Amino acid sequence: TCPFYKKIPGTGFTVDAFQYGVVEGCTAYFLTHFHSDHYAGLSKHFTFPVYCSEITGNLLKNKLHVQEQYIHPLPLDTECIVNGVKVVLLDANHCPGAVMILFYLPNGTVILHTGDFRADPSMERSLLADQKVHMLYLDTTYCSPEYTFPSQQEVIRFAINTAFEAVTLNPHALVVCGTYSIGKEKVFLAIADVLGSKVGMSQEKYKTLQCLNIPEINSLITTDMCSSLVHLLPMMQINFKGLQSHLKKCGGKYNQILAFRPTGWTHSNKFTRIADVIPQTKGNISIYGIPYSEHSSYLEMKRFVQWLKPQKIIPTVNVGTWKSRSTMEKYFREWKLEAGY
Ligand code: NI
């Protein structure tokens, strides 16, 4: 049964609620982004209207084979009417095609559902600036002050400078980057750009990337692994055994691997600066875990909420334990007392 925090009161609507069967009273199913914990349940047999971004609707049609007649893509930053209710989709600064949803209820209540997001001051000048928001359905993934990480730009700087150094010292080194979902494409695209290579990958991953409207993409990716010196592999293969095996397959073209695992947060964050990150090494294989996050840090989240000043917060992440829930509620009250709303 669908949990309460996936239901939008005063509407026929649900958000990211595809694994519960037919939800009683739901006239339109919204999908914030194409990550499996959120789309779980969709397939070619789904026959209700699904509302989403253009990019998400490309992925629904091509990857999950949802039929066209049930996909309702909406433009961003544009007032639209759905089953009699005004909605707006906003960029969530998450993965490609990920949105936040503003709902303008018939009784005057305004609700923001962030989906998954990485808060940013740029959001303070979107259409959110223009009216009051009463209820916030909030991505609370890293809602605790231990969760600090660097900007995306600092992390990409580290990665480019590390890859360029290694390959210039050894033109026979291969770079490998791990992936298991869409998101974080900047990691592998920025490294391939500095090296003058295309990124090589499986046919299944190339297909996914071709749904993303990324400019000039035919220029940056390929299925011809032999012509590429940056390869993408499944995240599970980014270990010494998996990498040794891959290196065997390249037929003596390469004699070293430098590999990257873009994790979110790891407790190496609580002690070490990005400048100071070091790899794990075995023989001619090195693996770097880099803290490239597509969710808000604690401070980014706090800033967003203290700017928005909502009347009520509904967490959508870490809701399964009483300790988590009590922790989050304590921080929400601190924020409200410090800011004065
Ligand atoms: Ni996500």
From Swiss-Prot:
Claim: Nucleus is one of the keywords in the record: yes
Tissue expression as described in the entry: Expressed in brain, heart, kidney, liver, pancreas, placenta and skeletal muscle.
GO biological process: cell division; double-strand break repair via nonhomologous end joining; interstrand cross-link repair
GO cellular component entries: fibrillar center; nucleoplasm
Top-rank taxon, per record: Eukaryota
Gene induction: During mitosis. The mRNA encoding this protein contains an internal ribosome entry site (IRES) in its 5'-UTR. This 5'-UTR generally suppresses translation while specifically promoting expression during mitosis, when cap-dependent translation may be impaired.
Main location: nucleus
Single annotated GO MF: zinc ion binding
Protein's cellular compartments: Nucleus
Keywords assigned by UniProt, alphabetized: Cell cycle, Cell division, DNA damage, DNA repair, Hydrolase, Isopeptide bond, Metal-binding, Mitosis, Nucleus, Phosphoprotein, Ubl conjugation, Zinc, Zinc-finger
Similarity comment text for this entry: Belongs to the DNA repair metallo-beta-lactamase (DRMBL) family.
Subunit structure: Binds constitutively to TP53BP1. Binds CDC27, which is itself a component of the anaphase promoting complex (APC). Binds PIAS1.
Stated role: May be required for DNA interstrand cross-link repair. Also required for checkpoint mediated cell cycle arrest in early prophase in response to mitotic spindle poisons. Possesses beta-lactamase activity, catalyzing the hydrolysis of penicillin G and nitrocefin. Exhibits no activity towards other beta-lactam antibiotic classes including cephalosporins (cefotaxime) and carbapenems (imipenem).
Name of the molecule in the record: DNA cross-link repair 1A protein
Organism listed in the record: Homo sapiens (Human)
Lineage of the species this protein comes from: Eukaryota, Metazoa, Chordata, Craniata, Vertebrata
Gene designation: DCLRE1A
